[PDB]
UniProtKB/Swiss-Prot annotation, chain A:
The lineage of its organism: Eukaryota, Metazoa, Chordata, Craniata, Vertebrata. It is found in: Nucleus membrane; Nucleus, Nuclear pore complex. Keywords: Membrane, mRNA transport, Nuclear pore complex, Nucleus, Protein transport, Translocation, Transport. One of its GO terms (molecular function) is structural constituent of nuclear pore. One of its GO terms (biological process) is protein import into nucleus. Plays a role in the nuclear pore complex (NPC) assembly and/or maintenance. Its main location: nucleus. Belongs to the nucleoporin interacting component (NIC) family. This is Nuclear pore complex protein Nup93.
């Protein structure tokens, strides 16, 4: 009877349905959870409206009170459980926003990693859902920077690393090869000499499986830029567009050291990657030397 | 019958819902197809009776639903309206079926129409001659039989229902009041008849009592309806109920006279009536010109006269007005050949000149119907069923096709799935009659109908109806269908149903393949490395991946499946999705080439074996070899990069530490031996396969016998591109491996051997590349 009568006005304004739910506080299941909890979760899913129910952050500050806050207590637990059911239904962005309301950055940062890692792996096109996810993630990052909100430092550093990675790929896709270059050496993941390979090894075990996957694309763009540099220098002789031959030769020698170190590390990584990636690594590096 | 029990019971099990009509609609079609199974396509009439019977059972089903609806719910008012449209389509079935069975009988009997004779015997000879001779009146008679069969079906048991309408006291109120006037101290100041005559009041102008006259009017509804239907047995029934045996007598003034007792003893052949009937109808004609009647008598005898103006008042329906058209024209005709057959041309009856000389045709039926300035008939005229059935009568094929055109212009929302099916049966019986309608309109209707049909899915339904199409369209639509059939159970079931009901599935799968090829394609570049900033899976990529299943399901499609799979392997690699290539290789069996070879052998025929199957064998093998050498090089590269351990180099330590160093050195011995053995085996195998793909077919690659630009110029372009792409680095990697293995003597002979223009392998290296190989030979 109750649930059918709720059906009579499910899409009505929120708090109205809330007093209906309020009667269901006394009711629950001895086989698990409460009908109250399940219904509030499902209906707020249908709602996608929160600033009145749980309240809202002014921008990111204190949570302004919600409607249920007046008649109910300890609403952060409801926040967490509801966003848990949301992500169980795959409602990732809204669950993340709800934990932003909850002040629980851990799952927020984890999930934004799983969100950005695929979209980061595509080209930089204006008005893209890649850009949407980028924007929400950078908003999260800026909020936590301003707030001093600190997760496990491993995840924090990896996330700042990722953000710098998007900066890199944006430069690459815009064709600002020099800017992307500067970005990568300040990212200091550039093994110019063979001695940086074991440093890259040390960096590797710091990584989770997902970024371990994405290192392949990272090094792909890397060798792309490297080969462009070497070929452009080779095409620039001393009688064409300047760039004297001695400087080009010395820089190409340094670059060849870098490329051979890159291939050595690519071979001596500890977990298996794509054989296509391996072959392409080797064949652009032969083009390099 | 079980059909009625099923109707009521499923009405109970179905009323919970709110759209039972379409559920029953789909429920109809399996019966359609089963019936097509049990009976042939020359038995279309029995098909029509089974149509009507089953759709009548469903009529009853919707009646049961609508009546089981509680008051105050028009949610099933839609159900009742659809049920109404259902009865309209039913009567359309009756109309067309009878009309064209009469058409068939006419076509059978065309060569003996019309007669001539002179009066020699009883006038029933005149009568049955007249009935047999003409067509126009014949179909008029049949359509009248239609309408009044409708009427009597509506009637049914009005007999048992009048059990409760009955009064058998003649003018009881006038009776009792004149009795009390004669009976009491005080009479009444009220005028009444002294006579019981059916014309006692109006002849005497004297009043009658309201209850008297109004139970009269009530029985007038009863019998008026009964005879507008002509329900004559019930007519004499009601007469002999209420004691109007006078009126029952009045009923007989028109039915003619006969007798045939020219045989045997004095026995009844016919005694029926008074032969004064021609003049008696003339008398009724003039009584009509006299007017002053009740509605009922006015209508009945203006009917018995076919008097148009005094028949105007009572008939206002579309059915009533067309009915009256037929009645009037049938009468005028029938009396015309009465006077024609019975020899006379002098005065024996009087009628107005225009009535005598009015001509009659089936065109006039609908011209009158249209020209009716009565808005009831006018609005009924625009109703679809009416237009449909009057086109049925008229055979106006151009008007029908244009009208269907405006229907489809409005779309399919006005033409529900059952409407589309009904127009479909329309066209079906057209064809089984060898009558052909306009084909683009037909295919438009059918495609919209099949759109419906697929909205209601049910693989068992689709194939026969699709079998009615232009070939390209039928192929495309069964493709759209079966590509959703993705679970092997109903998949194979759909294949058996398709092979049973037409449109083989194999050509369907191929057509899916080339349509997929037509939408999307992969990269092509014989220059080093595929251009991209970031790369990943595409919708086109997945579509090309997943079009394959349709071919791979059928074991018989293996040849073309392999051909297109190798082509898409080419697209994989040239679009830099070798991972897609390897996944598809894992998907496809490794013995497919041998299976195809064995199958072409098993037919005991190998002469018609073209270059093509054996080519497909070569592509499959060449992709296998190139990919395998690829992961072999990668495996050797990863293995060499994984040393067992470095030698222990710690200095002075403890005795237990010395034992630990000895254990470390022994472990180093085993690991180094195993790792080096594997490394050298991998090195040897890698160079072996390098030569195999570098010294294959005169050092060729992807090479094939048929590179015809008549078959595919793009195939040749792709293949030369593949060689120009893959050859350079393959040679350079061989140079690097041999140099690392200190095989510089092999580098010098291998670097000097890279010109095979026999199988397109001598013009794949470039100026900068040949410079690079010059420096490689220089390092060696």
């Amino acid at each position: 009877l109750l649930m059918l009568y709720t059906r009579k006005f499910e899409p009505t304004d929120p708090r109205e349905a809330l007093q209906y739910f309020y009667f269901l506080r006394n009711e629950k299941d001895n086989q698990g959870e409460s009908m109250f909890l399940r219904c509030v979760s499902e209906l707020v899913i249908e709602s996608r409206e929160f600033d009145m129910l749980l309240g809202k952050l002014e921008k990111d500050g204190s949570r302004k009170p919600g409607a249920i806050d007046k008649f109910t207590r300890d609403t952060k637990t409801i926040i967490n459980k509801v966003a848990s059911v949301a992500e169980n239904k795959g409602l990732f962005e809204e669950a993340a926003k709800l934990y932003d309301l909850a002040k629980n950055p851990d799952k927020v940062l984890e999930l934004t990693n799983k969100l950005l890692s695929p979209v980061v792996s595509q080209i930089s096109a204006p008005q893209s859902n890649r850009e949407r996810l980028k924007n929400m993630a950078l908003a999260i990052a800026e909020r936590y920077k301003s707030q001093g909100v600190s997760a496990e430092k491993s995840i924090n550093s990896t996330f700042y690393l990722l953000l710098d990675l998007i900066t890199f790929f944006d430069e690459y896709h815009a064709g600002h090869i020099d800017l992307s270059f500067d970005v990568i050496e300040r990212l200091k993941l550039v093994p110019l000499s063979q001695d940086s390979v074991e440093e890259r090894v040390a960096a590797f075990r710091n990584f989770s499986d997902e970024i371990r996957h994405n290192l392949s694309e990272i090094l792909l763009a890397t060798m792309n830029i490297l080969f462009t540099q070497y070929k452009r220098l080779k095409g620039s002789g001393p009688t064409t567009l300047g760039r004297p031959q001695r400087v080009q030769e010395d820089k190409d020698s340094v670059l060849r050291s870098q490329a051979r170190a890159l291939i050595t590390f690519a071979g001596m990584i500890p977990y298996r990657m794509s054989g296509d990636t391996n072959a392409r690594l080797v064949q652009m590096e032969v083009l390099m030397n | 019958s079980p059909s009625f029990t099923e109707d009521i019971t499923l009405s109970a099990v179905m009323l919970q819902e709110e759209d039972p009509g379409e559920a029953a609609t789909m429920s109809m079609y399996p019966d359609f197809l089963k019936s097509f199974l049990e009976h042939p396509s020359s038995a279309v009439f029995e098909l029509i009776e089974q149509y009507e019977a089953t759709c009548n059972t469903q009529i009853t089903l919707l009646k049961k639903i609508v009546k089981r609806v509680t008051p105050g719910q028009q949610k099933f008012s839609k159900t009742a309206s659809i049920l109404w449209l259902l009865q309209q389509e039913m009567v359309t079935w009756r109309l067309i079926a009878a009309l064209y069975r009469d058409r068939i009988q006419s076509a059978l009997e065309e060569e003996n129409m019309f007669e001539i004779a002179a009066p020699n015997a009883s006038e029933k000879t005149i009568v049955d001659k007249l009935f047999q001779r003409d067509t126009l009146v014949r179909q008029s008679q049949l359509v009248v039989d239609w309408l009044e069969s409708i009427a009597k079906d509506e009637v049914g048991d009005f007999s048992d229902n009048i059990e409760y309408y009955a009064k058998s006291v003649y003018w009881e109120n006038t009776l009792h009041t004149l009795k009390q006037r004669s009976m009491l101290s005080l009479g009444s100041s009220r005028p009444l008849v002294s006579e019981l005559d059916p014309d006692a009041p109006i002849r005497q102008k004297l009043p009658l009592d309201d209850l008297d006259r109004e139970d009269d009017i009530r029985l007038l509804k009863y019998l008026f309806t009964l005879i507008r239907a002509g329900m004559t047995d019930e007519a004499q029934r009601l007469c002999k109920r209420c004691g109007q045996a006078w009126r029952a007598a009045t009923l007989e003034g028109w039915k003619l006279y006969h007798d045939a007792n020219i045989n045997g003893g004095t026995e009844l052949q016919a005694v029926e009536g008074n032969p004064y009937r021609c003049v008696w109808k003339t008398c009724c004609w003039r009584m009509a010109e006299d007017e002053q009647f009740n509605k009922y008598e006015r209508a009945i005898y203006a009917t018995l006269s076919g008097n148009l103006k005094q028949l105007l008042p009572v008939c206002e329906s579309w059915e009533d007005t067309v009915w009256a058209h037929f009645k009037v024209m049938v009468d005028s005709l029938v009396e015309q050949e009465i006077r024609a057959s019975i020899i006379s041309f002098n005065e024996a009856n009087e009628l107005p000149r225009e009535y005598l000389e009015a001509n009659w045709t089936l065109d006039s039926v609908f011209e009158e119907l249209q020209a009716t300035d009565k808005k009831r008939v006018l609005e009924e005229n625009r109703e679809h069923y009416h237009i449909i059935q009057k086109f049925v009568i008229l055979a106006d094929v151009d008007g029908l096709m244009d009208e269907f055109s405006e229907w489809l212009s409005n779309g399919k929302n006005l033409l529900l799935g059952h409407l589309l099916r009904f127009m479909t049966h329309l066209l079906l019986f057209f064809r089984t009659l060898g009558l052909q309608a306009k084909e683009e309109v037909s295919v438009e209707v059918l495609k919209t109908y099949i759109q419906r049909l697929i909205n209601e899915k049910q693989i068992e339904l689709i194939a026969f109806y699709v079998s009615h199409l232009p070939q390209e369209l039928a192929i495309s639509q069964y493709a759209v269908f079966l590509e959703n059939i993705t679970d092997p159970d109903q998949r194979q079931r759909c294949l058996e149903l398709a092979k049973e009901a037409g449109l083989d599935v194999a050509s369907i799968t191929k057509t899916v393949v080339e349509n997929t090829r037509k939408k999307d394609a992969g990269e092509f570049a014989h220059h080093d490395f595929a251009p991209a900033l970031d790369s990943g899976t595409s919708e086109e990529d997945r579509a090309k991946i997943d079009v394959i299943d349709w071919l791979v399901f059928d074991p018989a499609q293996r040849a073309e499946a392999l051909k297109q799979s190798n082509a898409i392997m080419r697209k994989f690699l040239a679009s830099k999705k070798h991972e897609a290539a390897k996944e598809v290789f894992a998907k496809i069996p490794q013995d497919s080439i041998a299976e195809i070879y064995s199958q072409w052998e098993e037919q005991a025929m190998d002469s018609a074996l073209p270059a093509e199957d054996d080519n497909a064998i070569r592509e499959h093998l060449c992709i296998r070899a190139y990919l395998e050498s690829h992961e072999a090089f990668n495996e050797w590269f990863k293995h060499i990069n994984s040393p067992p351990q470095k030698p222990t180099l710690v200095g002075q330590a403890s005795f237990t530490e010395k034992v630990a160093h000895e254990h470390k050195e022994k472990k180093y011995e085993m690991d180094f031996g195993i790792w080096k053995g594997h490394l050298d085996a991998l090195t040897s195998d890698v160079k072996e396969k390098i030569y195999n793909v570098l010294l294959f077919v005169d050092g060729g690659w992807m090479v094939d016998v048929r590179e015809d630009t008549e078959e595919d110029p793009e195939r040749s372009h792709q293949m030369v591109l593949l060689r120009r792409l893959c050859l350079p680095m393959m040679c350079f990697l061989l140079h690097t491996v041999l140099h690392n293995t200190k095989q510089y003597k092999d580098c010098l002979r291998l670097a000097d051997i890279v010109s095979s223009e026999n199988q397109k392998l001598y013009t794949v290296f470039s100026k900068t590349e040949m410079r690079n190989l010059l420096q490689k030979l220089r390092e060696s």
